[PDB]
Every structure is written in structure tokens, then in C-alpha cells.
Design an enzyme around this catalytic site. Structure first.
Site, mmCIF file in Angstrom:
data_model
loop_
_atom_site.group_PDB
_atom_site.id
_atom_site.type_symbol
_atom_site.label_atom_id
_atom_site.label_comp_id
_atom_site.label_asym_id
_atom_site.label_seq_id
_atom_site.Cartn_x
_atom_site.Cartn_y
_atom_site.Cartn_z
ATOM 1 N N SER A 43 -26.962 15.755 51.153
ATOM 2 C CA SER A 43 -26.623 16.814 52.119
ATOM 3 C C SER A 43 -25.152 17.160 52.196
ATOM 4 C CB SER A 43 -27.117 16.434 53.512
ATOM 5 O OG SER A 43 -28.538 16.499 53.536
ATOM 6 N N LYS A 46 -24.359 20.792 51.588
ATOM 7 C CA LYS A 46 -24.550 21.847 52.588
ATOM 8 C C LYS A 46 -23.245 22.495 52.939
ATOM 9 C CE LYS A 46 -28.806 19.900 54.179
ATOM 10 N NZ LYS A 46 -29.458 18.781 54.877
#
Length: 261
Positions: A43, A46
């Protein structure tokens, strides 16, 4: 240096593979540990998707207010915010905040879609001078973190330099940069990672990531009180597919870095 010996010892104690890159913006000095090895981003990617949307908004001035429908089919494995808006809309700003501050995977997939696919996220990295970042897949499969697999990886050094440019530099317009910083400072998932190794008085903006192979990541901009900011990237992954997360390793690496500045 002392710091590299302590990071190597931390790594040896942990059983995994640790990558660290620190940029001290005071003198532009860098501290690197496995700085040019690839790690699964999970992540932490992101941030690049959100920044790419922010870059688009420099020309499409209203883009962040564009409503985007959240349908049941859009939901993937971890959607704390998007779940609250199924059969409704979220703006691109709300999706960017959700992706960054709650690590919402549905939000990330909507940002990828807005950019024309993972190739559009990668394209933004290239456009700001990051030749290392590669986003190949969408959520949740970009988190498989298979050893040796170059998909969805970057290096610590590359990510530190890029995070510096996005938050402290001028890869983004002034309003966009400020927005990104505000989003990162409001992260909710970071308390046990880099932040936990740092003085409580320091201001941190960060994005965590987690994946298979016990992959446990955090990338941060750090504003010490009375001192130039620092950019710190800590990546960690392990040899067992089902290994547990080790946020304490990231806290410990931050602490070792903090000892010395």
C-alpha cells in the site's frame, strides 16, 4: 557507520530483509541500507496514485470534486471507507484521503481507474523522474509480495527521492503538495511503525503498507521541531508466505536512524 551496523544487526535479529533510505534535507545527505534492492511496495504505492490524481487536478481544477460511484462489485478485500458509501458516491478527494489515511483498497482501485490503469500510475512516476517504481497490478493482487517478483516494486532509494519531491519539492503544484502533506499527516494506520521509533514531539506524515510474506512497510516525511525535515522509507519482507507483520522492525529502524541526527 554505526547506523549501518545497527541496521544490519536489527535485520539479522528479525529474520527478514530490511531496506531503509533516509534523506536529511538539511545537507541532502542519504543513509541507505539495501537502498537499491527491490521490495514489494504494497500500500505504499497509494501515495503515487494519489499524487498522480493531484497532478491531473493542476489542469482539471475541479477534478477532486468529481463524484465517483461505489458499487458492490467495486469492493475488494479491505474497504473501511468505501464500504460506508456503497451505492453512493465519493469524490476523488475523498477517495484519495481514504486510500492514504485508511489504506482503503477500493479507493486505490478507483484512483488507478481514473489514471487509465496501473500504466498510468507508473507513467506519473516516470514523468517526475522515478525510473524505478513500477505498478503492475490493482488491489488486492499487488500485495502478493512474492520473492524475486519485480511486479509492484520499487527501491528504498527511489521511493525516498520521489517522496521528497512530492512533499517537500515541487513535483506538484503548491496547493496539491499542501493537500498531499495534509493527507499524509492525517494517516491513521501508522502509530506502530515509523512513528513509534521517533520522539513524540516530531510531526510525521506517513503511509504504511502490508502484504504477504510478512511484508511490512512505511514511508514517511518527518518534521522534527527546530530542524530540517527528513524523508524516511522502511521496507521489510520475510521468507515465509504466511509470516506475520513486523511493524516493530520499522519502529526500531526509525529509532536507530533517529539516534544520530
Amino acid at each position: 557507520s554505526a547506523v549501518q551496523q545497527k541496521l544490519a544487526a536489527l535485520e539479522k535479529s528479525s529474520g527478514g530483509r530490511l531496506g531503509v533510505a533516509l534523506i536529511d534535507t538539511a545537507d541532502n545527505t542519504q543513509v541507505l541500507y539495501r537502498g537499491d534492492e527491490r521490495f514489494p511496495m504494497c500500500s505504499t504505492s497509494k501515495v503515487m496514485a494519489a499524487a498522480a490524481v493531484l497532478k491531473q487536478s493542476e489542469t482539471q481544477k475541479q477534478l477532486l470534486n468529481q463524484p465517483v460511484e461505489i458499487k458492490p462489485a467495486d469492493l475488494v478485500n479491505y474497504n473501511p471507507i468505501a464500504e460506508k458509501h456503497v451505492n453512493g458516491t465519493m469524490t476523488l478527494a475523498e477517495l484519495s484521503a481514504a486510500a492514504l489515511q485508511y489504506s482503503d483498497n477500493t479507493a486505490m482501485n478507483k484512483l488507478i481507474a481514473q489514471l487509465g490503469g496501473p500504466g498510468g500510475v507508473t507513467a506519473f512516476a516516470r514523468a517526475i523522474g522515478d525510473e524505478t517504481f513500477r505498478l503492475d497490478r490493482t488491489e488486492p493482487t499487488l500485495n502478493t509480495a512474492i520473492p524475486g517478483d519485480p511486479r509492484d516494486t520499487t527501491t528504498p532509494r527511489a521511493m525516498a527521492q520521489t517522496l521528497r519531491q512530492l512533499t517537500l519539492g515541487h513535483a506538484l503544484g503548491e496547493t496539491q503538495r499542501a493537500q498531499l502533506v495534509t493527507w499524509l499527516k492525517g494517516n491513521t494506520t501508522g502509530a506502530a511503525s515509523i512513528r513509534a521509533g521517533l520522539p513524540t514531539s516530531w510531526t510525521v506524515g506517513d503511509k504504511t503498507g502490508s502484504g504477504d510474506y510478512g511484508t511490512t512497510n512505511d514511508i514517511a516525511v518527518i518534521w522534527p521541531q527546530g530542524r530540517a525535515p527528513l524523508v524516511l522509507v522502511t521496507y521489510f519482507t520475510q521468507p515465509q508466505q504466511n509470516a506475520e507483520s513486523r511493524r516493530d522492525v520499522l519502529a526500531s529502524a526509525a529509532r536507530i536512524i533517529a539516534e544520530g541526527l
